[PDB]
Q: What sequence folds into this?
């Protein structure tokens, strides 16, 4: 029960060395075994690049506990076992830094309308429909245009590469954190009109699922 | 950032017309003895716009009004010429040292009073700010 | 002739063991024979899971009288015998608990526009049509988003399972109470916009028919 | 040149035993021969279920004069002979009762725009078009939702049976009386909104043609 | 350069016996030879039913001079000879009476948009089009509904027959007469609403071309 | 046809309330000595609508207002009861001898004065006419 | 062309009611000593429309208002009747010498004064012109 | 059905606040000698809506305003306490014995005076009827 | 930088005897050799009916200097040589008179939107397009209807003939003067409505190109 | 609940500006003897919104007005600076101990009087509540 | 964060002799070797007509340093080497002069919305989309119509030839400066209406991509 004003946007800029996990258990808060400590620490995000489990791939997780061999990740529930067969191995990297877009004018989205399959049986008369797949979700952002902004080069090279990038969005009023990753696209044609600011647009597709983490737990 | 815009507008105006008799806000001032024309300075606050969702980049609008007053029974052409000169000087796109003229050089209707006539000239100044 | 302000929403959360009924007679207020009384009492709702009577299946009914062998169900009329042939077997369960969604902003729906079959005969000149089946019905709800609320997991697991679930709507002004059951769909994409509340979406399909009973009689 | 304010609407509820007429002549006010008087009296409405004459089938008529053998029907003109060849036998019942809908919010209609057929000839240049059949007529009725209304059972049973039903409309201001018959469609899903009435839907198809008569003559 | 306020509409109701004309010449006011004077007099309209000349079929003309053998028609120009070859025979009837519609609310029309044929040649680049046939013309009229109006049967039988009927319209301000012939179509379902008049729709197609004559010359 | 509208409205109201103290238009009337309630009559002219294109079928709309006055310090429930009875008598669809009530039985808010209070009741009558 | 239209309308009204006491534009007239009804004549100017793109064909609109006055305490039926014959006489579509009645026979609401009451009757007239 | 609604509103408010000083319609009331807070009672007549096309099912809306007055120089939080308690008692959905509260517990801005301040609480009541 | 109010429109009504030309040179202001002077003089418009050069067909030009053998034309530039090959011949007439339409309500046109061709190549990723031919041009006019207007017959017979005709426009503010030619179309069904003027519709297509000259030079 | 909003606003304002002379609601206050600037606290009540269909989640919106007053002839820049200090303190999104600032720090045009000038600053507080 | 008011538009009018560059390297500011400087100098624009590198073809660049043999270009980044294989040769001309369109009223654009490829696989249920190519871009310009403006024939010949032309945009507030090239389209149909100015149309397609350089660097 809150107003979404005051939110902020951040985007992934550089990722560390790939880290391989050999086995992870299933529970409310998953914990996995890692070959080495590496450079992991308290409260730094990770992106999973590929794994045996189909649902968990392309997801942003937050580290909970760190030890020499045990790493604890929260943000995903693994209580169910049939959907999460045992003996799965993880593979993820870490996000070294973050960058923040200048002040953003509006936020828009599209899709999400659930589809239905309509079937009529000759035995009955009333027609009944069943739910089906969901439409794709695309997040588009618009913000002030700047000639010398240093993030423009980052966005251009990210668009050229097409590599999957993590996006962070923080809400102060409700104190949640939204984690998701997708393909980024950028537009560099100014919206030129008369007697108002001119903008450029940025769109983010979706590759995984939204995960929400408490701000205090995150930091 | 509203103090600096008023300061800049005042600085430009009085740098252009230091010598010519004028009145500025909230100071007791007496009109010329001979009844000649003199200038009036006014400042009007506009609205403050919140641009972005995070409320970090804002804008401030102000309106500057300068009036030329002239005695009755003396014609209008010299006053019109002076107003035209003021409008020509205060053209659009000029850059002040804090903000800039959003759009300028407008002349409006003559207000008539039986003690002395007045012609207004109005323009607007703007500042776009980003607080970090 | 009443205003629908003040209505309330409840959703099924848990059901008891399946109870098999051997035979039910046909009249205004049906009564059925049960092997064991079990945990049934006065004023508990039941969902019908499968029965020979095609129109009767996938419905929520309310108990009227309970005995060791006889259970009276009200809300459905079985006066007609051609649509309800005798000697039909019955099988149902009992709903244990309920949960109410936080305050609902708008309620939406679609469908019900009856289609027609239009035929033109060469003998005559005027064209006449015939009524035909009715379109599918879907119910859409809107309510405020909240992360810490518990029913989010219930809604996610109901969507994952796809199992039929009962919904209760209570209207105080008219003293009415509507029963229906269907498939659930939960949307977890907050609608972020400047200077108004952000909400989420819940959709309910339909598998049976609406039933209207007296709230005072039910409880 | 009259207002439709204060109009009232009635629907057929019960019909008497079928009455067969063996001989009827053609004129401004037709008179038919009946085997027995039956319960026929002054100013009681009749519905024709089937007859040799094609046009007047499925029509509502009003009696004018009653005798032990001769019955007078008014509302349809039978002066023409080519459309109404002699030796026609009638078959009609008597509407025993009526019921009226609660207060009705709005009345809408659709169809009736006459179609036209276009022929272009190589001999000439300007194109000319020819009238064709007219689209079907459907009438939709709206009234406030209720739970205890006893007419609901009649409406549902009529919808299930699919029998042709007579519909009557009375306009007090200009003193006419409209008559027609068709098939009924009923919806019992209330239109829930905020801070106004909630209503249900009733629709009537059309099988015959409108007949206009004076209420003073009717009663 | 005038106002069409106060205009009136009239429609043919009955035609006299067929009148045959043996020879007519071509000039600005055609003069024709008729076997007998008949009942023709000064200032009575005629409608042509069929003739050798293709252009002037289904046209309404006004008499100018009447003699025992020579009749004079005004309203159509016959100066040219290639389009109106000599040796043509006329066949027309005389309209006996006229009827006027009750007070007419709104007048509408549709059609007349000139179609074009677009051809592109590889020799050039700029595309040019040529004029072609026009769309058919329809005129729509609406007026207050009345049950006792004696012209309702006349309109019904005219619609049933489909016979081509002449229509006249009088404009007092411009002192002109527009006359034409076409097919009539009538609608008898009132447009019921709340707190305004309910009307019916009368539409007329076209079979010939418009004719304009002076009111002083006519009468 | 506008004279007959006032004639019929007066006829109906006067047949209903012959004996009650009442005031009609442009007649010198004095309030009752004891200060009891009395009725007020007014007639308001509405516009005339042109319906057809040939300007032959016309309509006439009129507004009729009846005011109930009462002394201060004597309560309001009897006045409200009288207004309710007036509204009950003036139902919608009632057929006057020359026209009919278009919509009626409306009670507006009380107008208050330091000498006495008044409750107005307003309704409308309509006549559709044909010219040849 | 606005002078001739006013002249013709004045001529028509004067020829109809030459004998009955009346008041014209800007001429000193004293009301009848007895206090009987007398008529008031007024003229209103309307806008002029440019119809085409070459600004050659135009139109002229005028409004004519006539008033009936009556002393207080004499009722309203005679005045309403008189207004009825005035409205009947000034029917729609009548052709004047230079122009024609665009829309006529309207009676408006009574204006009340404590010295005497007035009922207005208003209509409109039109002329169409082409200047080459 | 307008008299009954006012009677019911008076009954409910008075039964809740028998003892505390208050002022009602058209009754000569004097303020308390001490000058402490007292309540004001008002009734505002809203429009009546015709629901159907046959002109038989109707609704009645009314506005009830209760004013809390208090002396100058004594603060406002006591008045705000009384106001919240009034609003809490008059919640939405409460069923009066003739009608029901359409929408309740609305507090508007304080009107300020030099002799004594007053704060209003306004809500609305509704009754729906079917004439048979 | 001008305002188009106060313009006037004239249309070709009659042309003189056809005049042949033997040779013309190419330059800024062309000069052509003619067999005879004819009736040509200063400031009269000419229309070319057929010529070797494809670009200049159906063009309206103005004479500049007239001699016994040499005629100078202004309005078309012939500086280019590859698009205007040498040895070109002319064939033109002289426009005798002109007629003007009564006061005109509205001026409208459509078409001219240049089309594009989009081709996507597998070698690249961005899509680029190439412009193509332009759509046709049609000009429409609306003016007050009048019975006794004599130009109606001229429009009628010009529409019947279908011959190519010139149309002229004069704008006083800019001292410019437009000339072009095309095919005509007339509509004689007025659009009657309540309390405003009534008009008819005239349309002209485009077969050539616009010619722009100074009005002072023209006369 | 509406009292808590005013209580929280008073707590914050009074804690921030204890020592500075200020005027509270409905308390007899005398200005400083020297005529130095003093603060004027004021409270404006807005509407209350019913968000849902069960009439259970509500919203309360209130307007808070702070006015600064300064003697004539003493200039205006220092008053503007003080108002900027107030606005910067009352920044957007601040979490009040009961509600929160919907949007703050808006300065409007100066009101001029012949005895002393005044600058108003205005913001809004909001509370969303769930009723159980 | 700037206002585009006061911006100016220029279009290329003439180019010089073609100049060939034998080899160019890859870095932040590329440097190329040429046989001779030609007429190049400091800070003048160049257009590249054809080159080995696929994306740099049809681009507008600015020189940074000039020598007898070495030229330095800015506006394109050549930090990457896989997108710029070494040993590439350039071929570019020098724009001699520029022209300024008279004052322009509006500026509009279309396209740029990227397409998506939606794929659904049987293995999963939620649908995901991937970015695809971007739509074509067309710039539309509007400016006052002038009959004697000498830019008209230059625009006409450019449109007729179809030669690719450079377009220059200067924005004072941001100190930015835009460069691009495309095909020009001119419309010479004055949009005539009543009581406002009349304009013509100029449109520019796109073949390269936008380049931004600082104005102080430009001059």
A:
């Amino acid at each position: 029960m809150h107003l979404p004003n005051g939110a902020q946007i951040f985007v992934e800029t550089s990722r560390g060395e790939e880290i391989e996990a050999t086995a992870v258990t299933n529970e409310k808060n998953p914990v996995a075994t890692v070959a080495s400590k590496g450079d992991l620490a308290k409260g730094d995000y990770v992106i999973v690049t590929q794994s045996t489990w189909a649902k968990m791939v392309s997801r942003v997780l937050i580290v909970t506990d760190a030890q020499e061999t045990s790493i604890t990740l929260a943000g995903i529930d693994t209580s169910d076992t049939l959907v999460f067969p045992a003996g799965g191995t993880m593979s993820f990297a870490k996000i070294t830094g973050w960058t923040e877009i200048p002040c953003v004018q509006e936020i828009g989205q599209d899709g999400g309308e659930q589809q239905y399959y309509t079937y009529q049986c000759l035995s009955d008369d009333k027609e009944q429909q069943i739910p089906t797949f969901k439409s794709a979700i695309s997040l588009t952002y618009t913000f002030a245009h700047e000639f010398d902004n240093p993030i423009y080069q980052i966005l251009r090279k990210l668009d050229s590469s097409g590599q999957v990038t993590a996006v962070r969005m923080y809400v102060p009023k409700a104190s949640e954190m939204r984690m998701w990753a997708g393909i980024l696209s950028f537009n560099d044609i100014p919206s030129t009109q008369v007697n108002e600011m001119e903008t450029v647009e940025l769109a983010v597709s979706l590759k995984g699922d939204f995960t929400f983490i408490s701000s205090t737990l995150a930091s | 950032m509203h103090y600096e815009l008023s300061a800049a507008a005042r600085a430009a105006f009085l740098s252009k017309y230091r010598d010519f008799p004028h009145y500025m806000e909230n100071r007791n001032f007496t009109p010329p003895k001979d009844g000649g024309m003199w200038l009036r300075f006014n400042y009007i606050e506009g609205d403050t716009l919140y641009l972005s969702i995070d409320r970090k980049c804002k804008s401030y609008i102000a309106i500057v009004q300068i009036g030329v007053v002239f005695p009755p029974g003396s014609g209008v052409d010299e006053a019109r010429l002076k107003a035209k000169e003021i409008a020509d000087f205060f053209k659009d796109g000029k850059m002040l040292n804090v903000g800039y003229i959003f759009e300028g050089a407008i002349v409006h209707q003559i207000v008539k009073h039986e003690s002395g006539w007045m012609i207004p000239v109005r323009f607007t100044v703007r500042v776009d700010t980003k607080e970090t």
